[PDB]
Amino acid sequence: QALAKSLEQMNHLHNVKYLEAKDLTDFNQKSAYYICHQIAEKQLSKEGGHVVIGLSGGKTPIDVYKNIALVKDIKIDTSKLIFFIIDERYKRDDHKFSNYNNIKFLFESLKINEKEQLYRPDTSKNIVECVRDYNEKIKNMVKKYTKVDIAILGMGSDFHIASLFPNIFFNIYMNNYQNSYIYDESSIKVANTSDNDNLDLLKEYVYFTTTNNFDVRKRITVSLDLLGNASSKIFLLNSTDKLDLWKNMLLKSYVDVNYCLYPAVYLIDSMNTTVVTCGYTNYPQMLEDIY
Amino acid sequence: MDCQALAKSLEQMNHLHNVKYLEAKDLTDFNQKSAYYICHQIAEKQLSKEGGHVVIGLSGGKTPIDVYKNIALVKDIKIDTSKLIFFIIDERYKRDDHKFSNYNNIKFLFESLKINEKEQLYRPDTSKNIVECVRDYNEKIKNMVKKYTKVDIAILGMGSDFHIASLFPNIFFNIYMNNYQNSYIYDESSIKVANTSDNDNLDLLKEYVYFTTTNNFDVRKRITVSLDLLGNASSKIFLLNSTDKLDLWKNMLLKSYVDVNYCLYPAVYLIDSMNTTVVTCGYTNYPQMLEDIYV
Ligand SMILES: [Cl-]
Ligand SMILES: [K+]
Ligand SMILES: [K+]
């Protein structure tokens, strides 16, 4: 009620909607409210009611998910929801701190039947089989339910989203296609053609990617293409540091954006990206000043 | 500039986990101390080096440039500038316009020192196409190393993505895809890639100079000397003159404590290769802030 006013105070700038929070509590409430409003709007217009929602892990999304339970004035049929894990930190031998295990309280809160309503990687398999298996599962999800309706995302200090780590083309190619380790290399002809056009060649739904060992080296991620085709992308940027990064991204991507380096901009350019913000008052004015 | 106080500075450097830290009081002291240290390193190495031919690699950017401006000011020790050998550690490549290049931004140093660039400076010919630019500079650097044995001093910074020179994480993926894939620059068959560790694959890279890429705002196409070349330098000097840069170095050391990937944290390769020094500004008793990583 206090929150439904505020979805109306929303700023639009260069095809992004910005929703501003006043502090971290407001952020988590406003974010959870906006996500429920999107799910309900989508469900109301989808024949069969089966809204497909991609979830990221991490502290910022988790503290938002904790508030989803609290949302009471929005009618949603939770038995028809379909969830999938956008990306996972792979550790075959211990799953304790995984994104799934850190966010699964949400499924319990909403009384979700995970066997029927949740797609996630089987991280008990070896990395190659885990990736190929989750690929086919996401493929089947998209066939059955047409597309992703809502993707909930964050962004790291290296501009990565999901586990799509710059340079997304090099990282995907070297981890999946080189030596046909995961997918057939004969399928793809790299030119030495923009990175953007090269990433176009990679047609799978799920890939193996890598980052540093401290952050969990081996990752499973849905593809940038899958996320760009989502009907709604929601970024959760709840600090000045994150808002500073988003601004600098927009500055540096203004000319000849390489989507392999700034994947969030691919989502922007694909339309229907919303950013919820906390840290700066009148943040969208700060951005207009660079334009 | 007070060379008397500066000399004691150098005697007072702190050591932690095989790195030397030289702490500046403020930004002006950072520039003066860094230039003083580099000069003294050059002069001492010239007394031990074959024919006095100290080999110095130079980075560009504001931070090194402001240090280079102070190299003139250092009067308290003899350097035979006619014997020095310089090279460019990395370059931002634009075939059609060179005015914002590292070379062109730092060449005032060569004029100041009255350097004969034809005889004493190795740098890329960025009027060449990228493939030939890289192969030409690779051969120049190879010739430099054959003739002068190895790099004596490498002057470096580090970026917010942990890159140094133009060695952009993931260094193996970036170098492979830009140089070896489809034999664009070097032969694909000259290297057998495994899906082992990134460190082991990095070890397979044997050239001195590579093509790398980053974002278009920062100039997409880059020429860089190899991580191996830098690791073999007798002295590596990092110039970290802000708390942002010092926060990055500390985060790096935290995250690289276990199973460091040198393709993602190249500076740690340099640390592990020994003789790395860091000059710092922004945090008082900075090594104290790092201590507990190791104890
Ligand atoms: Cl990469
Ligand atoms: K898991
Ligand atoms: K140049």
Distance (Å, whole) CA B186 – CA A123: 38
Strands in chain A per DSSP E: 11-13, 16-21, 52-55, 82-85, 87-89, 118-119, 150-153, 206-210, 218-222, 232-237, 273-278
Residue A13: what are its φ and ψ, rounded to 5°? -150, 120
CB A267 within 8 A of CB A273: yes
Residues 6+ apart with CB under 8 A from B23: B14, B279, B280, B281, B284, B285, B286
Lookup result for tokens 């339910």: A145
Give B-chain residues touching A173 at CB under 8 angstroms: 173, 177
Q: Which conformational region is residue A179 in: left (phi greater than 0), alpha (psi within -120 to 50 degrees), or beta?
A: left
Omega into A167 within 30° of 0, i.e. cis? yes
**C-alpha dist (Å) from residue B273 to A175, A177, B21, B276:** 28, 33, 16, 8
Angle subtended by helix axes A99-109 and A59-68, to nearest 10: 10
- Give the closest ligand to the alpha carbon of residue A219: 2
Distance (Å, whole) CA B139 – CA B120: 16
Give B-chain residues touching A202 at CB under 8 angstroms: none
Residue A104: what are its φ and ψ, rounded to 5°? -65, -15
Lookup result for tokens 């913000």: A277
Say which DSSP state A112 is in.
-
Q: Give me the residue from B173, B195, B198 closest to A181, CB to CB.
A: B195
Task: State both tokens at B279.
Answer: 């000059």
Task: State both tokens at A147.
Answer: 């597309």
User: What DSSP element (H or E) covers A139?
Assistant: helix A127-145
**B interface test, pick of A181, A212, A244 with most B CB neighbours within 10 Å:** A212
Chain A within 8 Å of B250 (Cβ-Cβ)? no
Three-class secondary structure assignment of chain B? CCHHHHHHHHHCCEEECCEEEEECCCHHHHHHHHHHHHHHHHHHHHHHCHHHCCEEEECCCHHHHHHHHHHCCCCCCCCCHHHCEEEECEEECCCCCCCCCHHHHHHHHHHHCCCCHHHHEECCCCCCCHHHHHHHHHHHHHHHHHHHCCCCEEEECCCCCCCECCECCCHHHHHHHHHHHHHCCCCHHHCCCCCCCHHHHHCCCCCCEEEEECCCCCCCEEEEECHHHHHCCCEEEEEECCHHHHHHHHHHHHHCCCCCCCCCCHHHHHHHCCCEEEEECCCCCHHHHHHHHHC
Distance (Å, whole) CA A162 – CA B77: 55
Give B-chain residues touching A217 at CB under 8 angstroms: 259, 261
Give A-chain residues touching B260 at CB under 8 angstroms: 213
Tell me the one-letter amino acid at B120: Q
CB A131 within 8 A of CB A139: no
Residue A85: what are its φ and ψ, rounded to 5°? -85, 120
Strands in A61-181 per DSSP E: 82-85, 87-89, 118-119, 150-153
Strands in A149-231 per DSSP E: 150-153, 206-210, 218-222
CB A161 within 8 A of CB A273: no
Task: State both tokens at A246.
Answer: 């988003």
Task: State both tokens at A288.
Answer: 């207009």
* d(CA A2, nearest CA chain B) in Å: 39
Say which DSSP state A78 is in.
G
CA of residue A138 to ligand 2 center, whole Å: 16
Distance (Å, whole) CA B84 – CA B106: 16
Reported resolution in A?
2.0
**B interface test, pick of A214, A240, A241, A250 with most B CB neighbours within 10 Å:** A214
Distance (Å, whole) CA A133 – CA A140: 11
Q: What is the CATH number of the domain that holds A29?
A: 3.40.50.1360
HSE-up of B166 (CA within 13 Å, CB side)?
Answer: 29
HSE-up of A202 (CA within 13 Å, CB side)?
Answer: 29
Domain that holds residue B254: 2-295
**C-alpha dist (Å) from residue A247 to A56, A165, B162:** 22, 19, 20
Q: Give me the residue from A169, A170, A213 closest to B259, CB to CB.
A: A213
> Could you give the angle at the alpha carbon of B100 between the alpha carbons of B97 and B102, nearest 5°?
115
Distance (Å, whole) CA A207 – CA A154: 19
Residue A255: what are its φ and ψ, rounded to 5°? -115, 125
Angle subtended by helix axes B286-294 and B243-255, to nearest 10: 10
Three-class secondary structure assignment of B20-59? EEEECCCHHHHHHHHHHHHHHHHHHHHHHCHHHCCEEEEC
| Bridge partner residues of A180 (DSSP) | none
**C-alpha dist (Å) from residue B144 to B41, B57, B86, B139:** 20, 11, 10, 9
Distance (Å, whole) CA A191 – CA A178: 14
* Domain count of the fold of chain B: 1
CA of residue B108 to ligand 2 center, whole Å: 57
Strands in A120-249 per DSSP E: 150-153, 206-210, 218-222, 232-237
A-facing residues of B in 146-205 (CB < 8 A) are 160-161, 170, 172-174, 176-178, 181-182, 184, 193-195, 198
* d(CA A127, nearest CA chain B) in Å: 11
Q: Give me the residue from A175, A214, A262 closest to B255, CB to CB.
A: A214
